[PDB]
């Protein structure tokens, strides 16, 4: 498809990822198959990456990610930090790309809670809060532009097995336990020991606001350890709250689809019916770790309280895939099927790919999947988009 705008392409990581730099260069966006930027960058698609909190709440992750593009020094609005006791301001950026405050604009691929995060700054860009700009008035305070609302530099967002309506694993016994395994598999999968007191930061958790870092000395097993009792884990105004049925819903209550944004979903799952009860459970080649400690439950769950029943437990073992077409559960937004012509301000459902959660962006090996050509595929699309 002809190309129709030059928008360059913004990765946006989920509840695991980390900057280029990070990790000794092993990239989250490519894994053990490659760089995915790099992929992009070479075939003719200019594309950067995000680095934001990946235990921070999107709103965080948003001002984040806003500030990363645009330049400037974080802002997590004055009421927002004074309601949940962090910081207003987080780390300075110099700016990826400046000319979005000119009338350039973007395109962003995200992958896991990344596509709440993306949705979320789209939000904020075109209605800002009209909390933020209240509580600014009443206090004599600034007020970031964010928050201003009129904003728009987003021309498309494609969400990769996103939880849109929040994912099933949140629930699980000892969640908060085997969330923290879930970072320590990453890590591991990065060739990166939880046992070890690196000098080097190696994974930043980006957690400036609430004022925590891992110390001198500190293991990531002594620092999860930390951050499971830490605000990042126990307060509203986090990924995990986020995360759940109950908070992808509140999310949705607010953050919808803009007419000026194309939105592109891809689901994934990863198992198989059985022929007990009709639960899924992992297929072969599954990550390890999903399929040790996480298939089974998301493909045997149900909550007559939350509504969780069947048609939720195919999953790619972390999410369950009926979430992730686009959101739904407190949602006005319209999901449609893809025809063959993207739609603006609607979701395209663009089908459901036999890859798990840390395979489609490489973490985990899947021969099978051309993962190269699935990237080429999706760049060209968002590159096909009409301005
Ligand atoms: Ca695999
Ligand atoms: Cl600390
Ligand atoms: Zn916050």
Redesign the pocket.
């Known amino acids: 498809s002809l190309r129709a705008n030059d928008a360059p392409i913004v990765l946006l990581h989920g509840l695991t990822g980390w900057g280029r730099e990070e990790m000794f260069g092993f990239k989250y966006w490519g894994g053990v198959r490659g760089d995915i930027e790099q992929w992009l960058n070479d075939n003719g698609y200019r594309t950067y990456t995000l680095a934001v909190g990946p235990l921070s709440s999107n709103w965080d992750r948003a001002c984040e990610a806003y500030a990363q593009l645009v330049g400037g020094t974080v802002d997590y609005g004055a009421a927002h930090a004074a309601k949940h006791g962090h910081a207003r301001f987080g780390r300075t950026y110099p700016g990826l790309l400046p000319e979005l405050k000119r009338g350039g604009r973007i395109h962003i691929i995200a992958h896991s809670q990344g596509g709440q995060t993306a949705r979320m700054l789209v939000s904020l860009l075109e209605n800002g809060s009209q909390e933020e700009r209240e509580y600014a008035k009443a206090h004599n305070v600034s007020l970031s532009p964010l928050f201003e609302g009129g904003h728009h530099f987003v021309l498309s967002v494609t969400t990769i097995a996103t939880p849109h309506d929040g994912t099933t694993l949140v629930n699980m016994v000892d969640f908060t336990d085997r969330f923290f395994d879930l970072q320590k598999a990453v890590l591991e999968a990065a060739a990166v020991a939880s046992n070890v007191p690196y000098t080097s930061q190696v994974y930043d958790f980006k957690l400036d606001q609430w004022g925590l870092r891992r110390q001198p000395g500190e293991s990531f097993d002594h620092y999860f350890e930390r951050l499971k009792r830490s605000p990042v884990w126990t307060s509203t105004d986090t990924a995990r709250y986020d995360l759940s049925v109950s908070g992808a819903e509140k999310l949705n209550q607010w953050v919808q689809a803009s007419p000026n944004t194309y939105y592109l979903s891809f689901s994934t799952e990863r198992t198989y019916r059985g022929a007990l009860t009709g639960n899924h459970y992992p297929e072969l ?3 390890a770790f999903s399929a040790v400690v996480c298939a089974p439950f998301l493909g045997s769950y149900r909550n007559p309280t939350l509504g969780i029943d069947d048609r939720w437990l195919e999953n790619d073992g972390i999410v369950n895939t009926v979430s992730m077409n686009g959101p739904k559960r407190g949602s006005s937004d319209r999901i449609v099927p893809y025809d063959g012509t993207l739609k603006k301000g609607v979701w395209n459902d663009m089908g459901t790919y036999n890859v ?1 959660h840390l ?1 489609i962006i490489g973490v ?3 021969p099978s999947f051309d993962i190269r050509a699935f990237y080429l595929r999706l760049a060209e699309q968002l590159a096909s988009l009409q301005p």
């Open positions: 080649g599954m990550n798990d395979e985990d090996p899947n």
